[PDB]
Write a protein that binds this ligand. Sequence first.
Ligand SMILES: Nc1ncnc2c1ncn2[C@@H]1O[C@H](COP(=O)(O)OP(=O)(O)NP(=O)(O)O)[C@@H](O)[C@H]1O
Ligand SMILES: Nc1ncnc2c1ncn2[C@@H]1O[C@H](COP(=O)(O)OP(=O)(O)NP(=O)(O)O)[C@@H](O)[C@H]1O
Lengths: 663, 663, 285, 285
Amino acid sequence: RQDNLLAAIWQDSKGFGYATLDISSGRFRLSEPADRETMAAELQRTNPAELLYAEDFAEMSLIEGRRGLRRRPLWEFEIDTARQQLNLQFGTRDLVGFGVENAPRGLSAAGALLQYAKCTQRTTLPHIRSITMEREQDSIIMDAATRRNLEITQNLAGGAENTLASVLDSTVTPMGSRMLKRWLHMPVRDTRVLLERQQTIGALQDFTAGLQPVLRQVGDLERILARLALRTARPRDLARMRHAFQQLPELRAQLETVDSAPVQALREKMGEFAELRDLLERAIIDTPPVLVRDGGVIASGYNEELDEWRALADGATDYLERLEVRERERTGLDTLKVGFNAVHGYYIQISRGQSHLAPINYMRRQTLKNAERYIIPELKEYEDKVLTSKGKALALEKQLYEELFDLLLPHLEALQQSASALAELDVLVNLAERAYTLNYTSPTFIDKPGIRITEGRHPVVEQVLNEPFIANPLNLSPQRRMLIITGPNMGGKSTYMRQTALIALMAYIGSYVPAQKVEIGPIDRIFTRVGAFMVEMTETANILHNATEYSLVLMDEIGRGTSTYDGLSLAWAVAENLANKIKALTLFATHYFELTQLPEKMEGVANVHLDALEHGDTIAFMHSVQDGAASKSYGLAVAALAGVPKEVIKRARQKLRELESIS
Amino acid sequence: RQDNLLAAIWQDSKGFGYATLDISSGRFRLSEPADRETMAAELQRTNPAELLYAEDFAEMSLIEGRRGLRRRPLWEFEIDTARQQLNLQFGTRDLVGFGVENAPRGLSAAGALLQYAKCTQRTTLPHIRSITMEREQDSIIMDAATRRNLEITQNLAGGAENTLASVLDSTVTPMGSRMLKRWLHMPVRDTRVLLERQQTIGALQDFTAGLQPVLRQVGDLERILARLALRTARPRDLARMRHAFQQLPELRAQLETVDSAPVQALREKMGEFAELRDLLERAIIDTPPVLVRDGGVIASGYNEELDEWRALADGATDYLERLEVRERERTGLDTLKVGFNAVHGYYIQISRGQSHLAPINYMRRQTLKNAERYIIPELKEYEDKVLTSKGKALALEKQLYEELFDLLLPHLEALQQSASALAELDVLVNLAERAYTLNYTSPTFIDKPGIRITEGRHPVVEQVLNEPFIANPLNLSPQRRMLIITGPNMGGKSTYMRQTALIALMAYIGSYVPAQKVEIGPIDRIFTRVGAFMVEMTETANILHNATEYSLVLMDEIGRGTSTYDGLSLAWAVAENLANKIKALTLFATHYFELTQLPEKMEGVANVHLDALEHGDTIAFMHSVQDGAASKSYGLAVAALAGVPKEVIKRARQKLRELESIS
Amino acid sequence: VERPASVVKELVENSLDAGATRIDIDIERGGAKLIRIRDNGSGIKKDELALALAIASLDDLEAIISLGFRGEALASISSVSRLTLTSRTAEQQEAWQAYAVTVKPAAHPVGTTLEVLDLFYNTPARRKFLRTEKTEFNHIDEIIRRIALARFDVTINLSHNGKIVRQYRAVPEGGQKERRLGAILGTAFLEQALAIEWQHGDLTLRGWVADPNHTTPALAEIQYFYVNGRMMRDRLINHAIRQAYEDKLGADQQPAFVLYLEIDPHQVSRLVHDFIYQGVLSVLQ
Amino acid sequence: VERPASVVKELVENSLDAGATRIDIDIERGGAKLIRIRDNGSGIKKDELALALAIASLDDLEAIISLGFRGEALASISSVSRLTLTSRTAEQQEAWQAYAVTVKPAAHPVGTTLEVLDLFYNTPARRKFLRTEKTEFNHIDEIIRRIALARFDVTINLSHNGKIVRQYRAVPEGGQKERRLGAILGTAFLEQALAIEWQHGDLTLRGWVADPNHTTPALAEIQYFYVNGRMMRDRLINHAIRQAYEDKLGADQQPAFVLYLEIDPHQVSRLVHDFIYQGVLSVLQ
Ligand SMILES: Nc1ncnc2c1ncn2[C@@H]1O[C@H](COP(=O)(O)OP(=O)(O)NP(=O)(O)O)[C@@H](O)[C@H]1O
Ligand SMILES: Nc1ncnc2c1ncn2[C@@H]1O[C@H](COP(=O)(O)OP(=O)(O)NP(=O)(O)O)[C@@H](O)[C@H]1O
């Protein structure tokens, strides 16, 4: 009933930083309002009883009226002094364990808050043991590990293929390929947005054929419009742009029939611009050169004066030829050529041996090694008019090209809109094709955290594998919330886990999913931890501190302690916390066989395993998920088959025989 | 004692591939002769009794005379069919365990060999269980893991800093910075090359000051010479090149006094090229433009005709001005400007309001918005000569620039030599400064594999740490060849290992090393295994199959089996093999405490550990290497300090107490 | 066992005889390098693989080659190839595989898979004869196109050099024949398609004929006629359709059609001709 | 305890009195942000740290402040800072650290380290007085420069904002004074340096004086005179050198010198002047 809270605030040239604290409870928080308006909203939201601010704070309009205003020195809002004091209080060397390491504007505010707090209280403050971020966009949250590990766009070591992007990037235009990639790094939780895209995908599944080919011809319109604004655009950029407008009437016709409110919306957004289309059909040649510099861009029939000066220049090609033939056959000197040199001008070249036979009507203009070049009156007067006419035509061609920018820029706003609309279609047309071709099903959403899969598949792995992928079901709810997985390596453990995370991501971007049936609840954050120790302990805590009832947590083979069982001791406590306190949707893979005791100890946890079969002369991984814990050790079998020398393996199995004679 | 062997050979457009096999012994090999000559050398070396070749083999001169010539079909030398049949024989799905995965030209040859062999023998061939590469470059070998893990040039995640390169890149010119980086990826085993560089480093340690500043002014000469050969070179490339030649006489003077045979060698190799220097001082302006295309590159006084046509054009600026002043003050119209337009030509502009006051003389050439532009007889005749003179001067400026290439290309060989010499100086001058400033010592070499370090330091880690790095000694020999290391995480295990590998690398490029004293034997290959399982077992075998007595092997925390001790079972057998058969210089880090039994079981193996200290219950890592195995598990202590909530930690230690009440 | 196209066809119909509804064909480089057919039809037991490829195992087990004429066809391929095959029967069986005289177990769903490295492995000649890569793929694709139209009810997936080319989705009873028809024949045919359904008792004619008024010779590539599963060619049928085309419009430009006839056992009768001509010409007007 | 330069000097000489031969000084942003002095001299025991900054030390854990007047100086810094200190003595000790009343252990070699976050932490005024980052660094560097020349035998490392600025290598007995002299004074001074060695019994003059004929006022920044380790200023000395400079060349342009005078503990005296003048003028000619 009573917020009686404390807060701190600060500004740099980027935005505004915020932190809140209560001493009656110990709750310690951080956030970063991006703009002036959101910062205002967050103040009254929290309604603190006291408010610390730096003497430098410029936007006094936000805080002047607030109760408990307290001016403080600047050096207190020092980031490193802040970082330093905070690490002491929690008893750590890093704030990675809290997942607020990259929030410096807020941390500067929390730094002065703690320094103030130290001095104000001097009462029991061990109940201030933590700090979490108040994440403004509780849509979906992903850390660096999740962004690289799922392989959305960056494969493990930086390459491009074997990603989720590499599967679904069957988009025709580059602006659509880029747009697709943005959608995967940003799924959102609004049901409206999701149902729009699903419904669109379904109504377009039939029209896939006619649509894709047309969109490719558009080209990279998004980036051509940039050069237009900059006034850098080249002849060939406007040609693809021209051809892109020739597609619009046809796309209008194709999308007309598609019965769907979302589709008809994007149909309008597309645009028409028949005015711009006509201009360019008359203004530019069908296939123009790379640069404007050398001419041959602006068409005949477009401008009066352009064609006039070109007619003078175009009276060149045929005259040079007649001059060459006239003079060659009058004299009877076959090595007579008509050519040009930038420095000297036009000339009549004769070889060295025939140079003595020239009528010397011919004046010597230029002497070579094995040829003498000459000039006569008829060529020299003609020289002046041809080159200078080209120049006036070429100079005018550059005048008129600068003019073409002035004409097109007026529709620039609407072209940006046409570019975003066409790119979105390419994405949704593409996803409809993948859903049909790859045999995907639409997912459904529920009110509480929970997942129900029927014969779910791994969308990346299933494609590379030119053999059967063993699909597997899944059933999670707030009551059945943790699954402990034991068994062989390459057994399909991490696979069975990772397929579920991708399925969830795909659901929350609005696409169809690789399974028979998919039911799923809300998911606020996705967290990820992958094996190897400086590394491990540090980041296990990030997930524990932040995760919620609605979150998804994905543990891969933790517990590489400094001994045998000190590492097991950790994993047990870890699991009990996630299952008992946080009650999140958890999937716990581990090789430590002893953790399979939990279900009898802990309600709401259950055992599963990747069963594998040892027979004949070899091992066959069934990749088939079964209830109950794994049977045994499979590691020695694994080692051999990957490609270990047989000599070594004998010594290993011998040693294993020794270990199992202890008990 | 004579060779009675079998072999196979093949060629593509890249080079020639080779493989050898014996059925009396089972020895199976592969290599890839890079050039036609080395291929010849390798044939007589092996002197096979029979030789398979593809019907397509073009270089018959190598093999015509050889005994046992056998023509075979092409499809047999298919790479994938080859790969397929080979995986069957060894019983695997990959040849990564043998480290010949990226030798396809040889594997195509071994493919037809095995298919021939299968059919020819049909006798016991389980004794053919392996294949290793005959590595032409037995200088030093490094795989992908070693190249990224040491952080030579690429830090873990692709960034540039915290690398060995980042320490030593205090080089002044880019061609030297690039050269440094080549040297790190390619150390060689010739003692002469090593002693050259060490001696050079010592004699230059005093002259560091005067030398570095001069080398910077050279600029990136290496890549400017490329554009010279291509004929792309721009005006400003030749300007920095000109300035680079102005450095040569100075460098000659500085290096004269430096008494060292290697230094005086590089002093000569530098060159002089006073001829080229003079040309460019006269030929190009002090500060030329980015491109040749718009002129202002070639100097006045360089060419007769250039200055002549420029004199006609330079008669423009003063005439345009007199015309403007004459006409402005004759009329009394102050808004009279003289300007130019590409399309219409020169003009005399008067504002709209004053246009009615212009004299009858002025013909209207162009009408604007708020101004009328005019032309008179005096400007129009003058217009022709000025623009066309510029053009002939500009056209000639391009003639002469193309000329400058023809004149310089003759010494291109010698310039390549000068460029390589200057780049090598920058490298050696740089390493002398680092060796002095960072307090490094020169290493000494021995005949047998063995390493003896005195207070060795980690050269990268010591610098970013603004506190003490704990230096540690090391002693390895053919008799003391393995060290088993247990203890805490972040204890300094991987560190104590990794510092040793870098030390070896630095020794085998010819540089000084971070320690008191360094003695070291020959080292042929460096191998690297870092934790995390498809991954782990696959590559543990690569190292086992290839490694030798002279090699350095670096094992980090292996044995993540599918259970508790199946993973330990592996590590035991692994260790016994490296120490007992291969007898390599090995460093084995492992968390499994039970492996510390080996020294008493195994001759030539010894226990060490990173001791750490617990008071109350918070921890100081001494990072100090001591004889004997570690004391205990330290993992729970590790977890807490990285940043785990204390609440969880209590539950963990409780559970640890439960595990140790089992016995 | 002459072209690669023929080896594809027989193994496709082997799976069809086993009640297969999903036949996934993966092929690489004309079929030389790779031919992989995976079928979901009735599988094969562990004892039954051994002998189909071992050849002296039926000297008195005697009874099991009885199971198929497909089983008779496998042997002719496998002795003269690097054949690999995996199969799992009924349910709760393990999968089993064989190499070419050696067998062992594996892991598979209930069905069959058949992998082949360029058939001829001991014949130097008969492989060195084998024609192009691209052109053989076109023959294979034609063969599958012909099986495809006959059996609208079986899903067939054709991929070349890894990447998929044809995904022929099956048509359910009470379903869309256009989805499949356009995928096979391209958009082109689908545009001018006029359906035909004629019946006088036992004679039943189903199919499609293109509108001659807008038909070009680019549509006319398509001329298929099937009878109770398979296409035979006889000159009788050839005239029936062209008479109808030439009499509809005097301009006799090439006709486009795909038609299926269904009847009682007689290999051929005169009525056969007249029945067809009547059906076609009516639809046009 | 007024400028940051002064806090540096005292903690430097604290380490000197403990027999330190390597003093590494790391400073950041004028010294405000960071001041770290790490010394390899004699360290400090666990009970001896506690009370130097927790005054019932010399009663309850007693007669131990006796150990240093450095221990008297630490207290004046630590109460008014975010001080941090770690030290390890003699042998097989652990390292120990404190904040200023809270202490605990750590890991270090036999020596001492002293870390400071911007001295004044409770004083709003005396910090708001502290003025520039760059300019304060210049005062510190001057202070260290003066300690450097007095003690040629101690290696001193000065780094600013992470990156190192000065690395003063010590001079061994029977060694090169030039390595260090050029590093301190730049190559500039080293070029025109003429050594001076005068002695009349107890009076001993050692050092260097620049050749006036090529000396510019850019060399003249350097004017230091020490007496038995420390520089005092008295006007007597000022004249002795300038008389010799003005009499050598009538153009009285600014002199460049670094000189050390060495005597018995008795402050007195007229001979002091004449001794010096004689020594300088002779070297010049
Ligand atoms: N000799 C040393 N002196 C000072 N600091 C060190 C030293 N060695 C390592 N460190 C620090 O300790 C960290 C990691 O040590 P490391 O050698 O990787 O531990 P480990 O015992 O190999 N086991 P793990 O780190 O868990 O794989 C680094 O981040 C360093 O900052
Ligand atoms: N359901 C499945 N069907 C077919 N192949 C699979 C399946 N699951 C996994 N694989 C294959 O198994 C390989 C590696 O297995 P993986 O799941 O990484 O093992 P793991 O048990 O997680 N151990 P680790 O990789 O060390 O964490 C992959 O590259 C796949 O090619």
